[PDB]
Amino acid sequence: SDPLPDNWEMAYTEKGEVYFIDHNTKTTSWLDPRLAKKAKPPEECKENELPYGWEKIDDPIYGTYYVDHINRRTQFENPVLEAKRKLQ
Amino acid sequence: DRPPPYVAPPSYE
């Protein structure tokens, strides 16, 4: 399974970072559409697991935070821990 | 206070 979906391309930033180009909707995304996984409510994930689309970033200057590439959000709290906390 | 903002990929060309 190498090919991208029809009417997609992939390209690279000057920093060598891959991203994906969707000509169907005239948008770009960091997410590889070939790698999409089933959505899961955050509270239903295991302790050391993140839902699909999330990335943990450890910034030397700004510390740890979480990035949601589906909704394009960033937050300090681990989203799985947050969901469990608010529902607990 | 907030974390670094979302950094988007290059815009669609």
Residue numbers in the entry:
A (entry chain A): 300 to 387
B (entry chain C): 222 to 234
Q: From the publication, what sentences describe this entry?
A:
WW domains organize molecular assemblies by binding to short, proline rich peptide motifs each with ~4–6 residues. The type I WW domains bind to a consensus ‘PPxY’ motif (where P is proline, x is any amino acid and Y is tyrosine, also known as PY-motif) with very modest affinities (with Kd in the range of a few to a few tens of µM). To achieve this goal, we determined the high resolustion structures of 7 representative WW tandem/target complexes, and measured the binding constants of >100 WW domain tandems or isolated WW domains binding to known or previously unknown targets. In this study, we discovered that WW tandems, but not individual WW domains, can bind to target proteins with extremely high affinity and with very high sequence specificity.
By sequence alignment of WW tandems, including those from KIBRA, MAGIs, YAP, SAV1, WWOX, ITCH WW12 and ITCH WW34, we found that MAGI2 and MAGI3 WW tandems have striking similarities to KIBRA WW tandem both in the inter-domain linker (23 aa in MAGI2 and MAGI3 vs 24 aa in KIBRA and with ~60% sequence similarity) and in the C-terminal helix regions. We further found that MAGI2 and MAGI3 WW tandems bind to Dendrin PY23 with extremely high affinities (Kd values of ~2.3 and~3.6 nM), further supporting the conclusion that MAGI2, MAGI3 and KIBRA WW tandems share a high similarity in target bindings. We solved the crystal structure of MAGI2 WW tandem in complex with Dendrin PY23 at the 1.65 Å resolution. A structural comparison of the MAGI2 WW tandem in complex with Dendrin with those of the KIBRA WW tandem in complex with various ligands shown in Figure 2 showed that the overall structures of KIBRA and MAGI2 WW tandems in these complexes are similar to each other (RMSD values of 2.3–2.7 Å for the Cα atoms). Notably, the extensive interactions between the inter-domain linker and the C-terminal helix stabilize the supramodular structure of the MAGI2 WW tandem, and the Dendrin PY23 binds to the MAGI2 WW tandem following almost the exactly same detailed interactions as those observed in the KIBRA WW12/Dendrin PY23 complex. In the WW tandem structures of KIBRA and MAGI2, a hydrophobic residue from WW1 (I35 in KIBRA and L330 in MAGI2) inserts into a hydrophobic pocket formed by WW2 domain and the inter-domain linker. Indeed, the I35D substitution weakened KIBRA’s binding to PTPN14 PY12 by ~50 fold, and the L330D mutation decreased MAGI2’s binding to Dendrin PY23 by ~57 fold. The extensive interactions between the inter-domain linker and the C-terminal helix couples the two WW domain into a structural supramodule in these WW tandems, thus providing a structural and thermodynamic basis for highly synergistic bindings to target proteins.
